[PDB]
Amino acid sequence: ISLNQQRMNGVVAALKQSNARRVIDLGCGQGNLLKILLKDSFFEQITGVDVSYRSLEIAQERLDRLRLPRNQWERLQLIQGALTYQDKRFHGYDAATVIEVIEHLDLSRLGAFERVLFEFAQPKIVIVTTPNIEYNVKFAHRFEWTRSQFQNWANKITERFAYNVQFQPIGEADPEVGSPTQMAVFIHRGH
């Protein structure tokens, strides 16, 4: 029950409760979450997106360490691309996951990513997790966000975009500085 494993379980759990079968992982990195989704037949489509070629090659590498039925491999798709660009391949998914990605975006990229995600793609579900820098300080990697910053960011999202947000920490209550990992589950409003 490591921290990362806690994050993944938390994300998979949120996807399932929303019955999000078709998922796109933005900033997929080495494919940690992609490996878990591909192995799980609950998911009907797994797509991972990253701007790094090195990371995508590695993702494909470990994803290949899996043994799966033939029809199961056709669910996977790897795409190189920046998250700040409106890619038509980002449409039609039940959910988009942005895991430990926001902290590594500067101002001239965060705003663009927000539109790409909450306006352009506009999936029904969006799961975002980021490190709680208030936990990393009390229990020692410092450009992370505070619980306040993260929650204001997310609330500001529901003010500009057609979404409502629910917070669900995945780590373990301090219970003074909250859990080590903050998660936000955005659900699109009905029309």
Residue 50 sits in the site that holds ligand SAH (CB under 6 A) = yes
- Beta carbon nearer to ligand SAH, 50 or 94: 50
- Residues followed by a break in the chain, C–N over 2.5 Å? 140
Burial of 6 (0-12, 13-18, 19+ CB in 10 A): middle
Give the Å distances, CA to CA, from 96 to 67, 104, 173, 180.
25, 18, 26, 22
Pick one of 46, 63, 83, 154: the residue that binds ligand SAH (CB under 6 A).
83
Contact status, residue 10 vs residue 168, Cβ threshold 8 Å = yes
Hey, how many other C-beta atoms are within 10 angstroms of the C-beta on 5?
Answer: 11
Contacts with ligand SAH: how many residues (CB under 6 A)? 17
Residue 51 sits in the site that holds ligand SAH (CB under 6 A) = yes
Alpha-carbon distance 87 to 168, whole Å? 29
Residue 131 sits in the site that holds ligand SAH (CB under 6 A) = no
Pick one of 104, 156, 160, 189: the residue that binds ligand SAH (CB under 6 A).
104
**Shortest CB 40 distance to ligand SAH, Å:** 15
Pick one of 6, 18, 45, 52: the residue that binds ligand SAH (CB under 6 A).
52
Work out the angle at residue 45's Cα, subtended by the Cα atoms of residues 41 and 116, and round it to the nearest 5 degrees: 145
**Shortest CB 101 distance to ligand SAH, Å:** 5
Nearest to 28 by CA among 9, 5, 2, 54: 54
In the three-class reduction of DSSP (H, G, I as helix; E, B as strand; rest coil), residue 28 is classed as coil
Residue 181 sits in the site that holds ligand SAH (CB under 6 A) = no
- Beta carbon nearer to ligand SAH, 39 or 174: 39
The pattern of x and - marking residues 6 through 35 that bind ligand SAH according to CB under 6 A reads: ---------------------xxx--xx--
Binding site for ligand SAH (CB under 6 A): 27-29, 32-33, 50-52, 55, 82-84, 99-101, 104, 109
